[PDB]
Amino acid sequence: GSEEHFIETISLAGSYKDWSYSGQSTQLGIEFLKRGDKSVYYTSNPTTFHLDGEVITFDNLKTLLS
């Protein structure tokens, strides 16, 4: 799926518009997007994303940045 192709684009660029790219270990997952106290995490083998330990899709991510 194309979300898993975006996960690679994260690693290529090391930031977005107004958001920093990460990778610290937490009780919620591994960090992979950061802005102030707000963090998005990932942990699986396929594509996966969560805000503050609760899972979201690209739809719920895309408005979370925009």
Number of domains into which the chain is organized: 1
Method underlying the structure: NMR
Distances (CA, A) of 59 to 1, 3, 11, 23, 50: 14, 10, 20, 22, 12
Q: Mapping DSSP to helix (H, G, I), strand (E, B) and coil, where does residue 32 land? A: strand
Q: Cβ distance 65 to 16 under 8 Å?
A: yes
Q: Cβ distance 15 to 21 under 8 Å?
A: yes
DSSP 35-62: ETTEEEEE-SSS--EEETTEEE-HHHHH
Domain holding 40, by residue range, is 1-66
